[PDB]
């Protein structure tokens, strides 16, 4: 069931395994638990334009595909 979402930060590339039927907030919660961070945003591109919204109910799978990389901005 689960897919892989890669999170690029200044600490490296963190692999998050998550159900595509989960919501974006769960992704945010997953990242928080995996990383030592404060207020962060997740973005679709390295230049931080399109922010992923801390949900619930925008599903992971509607905006993201297996192996996609998102970009963390503090």
């Amino acid at each position: 069931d689960k897919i892989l979402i890669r999170v690029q930060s200044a600490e490296g590339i963190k692999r998050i395994e998550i159900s595509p039927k989960s919501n974006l907030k769960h992704l945010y919660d997953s990242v928080q638990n995996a990383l030592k961070v404060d207020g962060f945003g997740l973005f679709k591109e390295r230049n931080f334009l399109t922010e992923l919204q801390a949900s619930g109910s925008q599903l992971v799978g509607t905006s993201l595909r297996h192996g996609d990389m998102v970009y963390l901005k503090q």
């Binding site: 892989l4 890669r6 200044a10 600490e11 490296g12 590339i13 963190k14 692999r15 390295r46 192996g67 990389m69």
Partner: protein, 159 residues
């Protein structure tokens, strides 16, 4: 090919980029590596270096394509064997010291690194082909160690 999935036979690069290794998508599927992943490569004489992995539609499954700069950092020749593994902790460089082997920032290093997010490893040699003369450089130090991304926040000490 190698009897282990992550050992690959070295082949010449089509894309001359010091920072890139190419695999077939099928091999990448097999090893669970993805476009733009930082990977740690291991060659002979206990040498390691870091590259960015990209798919290459004409790369045979059991082969890996890399240029001479990367081969040299790994102490391998064409048709030698290297291993490739995802490397999740390649942090953004705070400060790095890079020196010419045997102006430098402005002409060579800045354009080489600018917006490219190149991984570098301490002990790496690399060649920058700029101006009127190629220059080979050595990665003397990185902070953090032993490898990092040269990012917009990174400071290069080159003198």
């Amino acid at each position: 090919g190698a009897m282990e999935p992550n050992r690959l036979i070295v082949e010449e690069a089509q894309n001359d980029d010091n920072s890139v290794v190419s695999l077939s998508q099928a091999k990448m599927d097999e090893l669970q590596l993805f476009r733009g992943d930082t990977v740690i490569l291991k060659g002979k004489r206990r040498k390691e270096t870091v590259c960015i992995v990209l798919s290459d539609d004409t790369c045979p499954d059991e082969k890996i394509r890399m240029n001479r700069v990367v081969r040299n950092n790994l102490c391998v020749h064409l048709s030698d064997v290297v291993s490739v593994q995802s490397c999740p902790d390649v942090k953004y460089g705070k400060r790095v010291r890079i020196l010419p082997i045997d102006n430098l920032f402005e002409i060579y290093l800045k354009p080489y690194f600018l917006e490219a997010y190149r991984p570098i490893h301490m002990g790496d040699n690399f060649i920058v082909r700029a101006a009127m003369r190629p220059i080979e450089f050595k990665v003397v130090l990185t902070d953090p160690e032993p490898y990092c991304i040269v990012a917009p926040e990174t400071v290069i000490f080159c003198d």
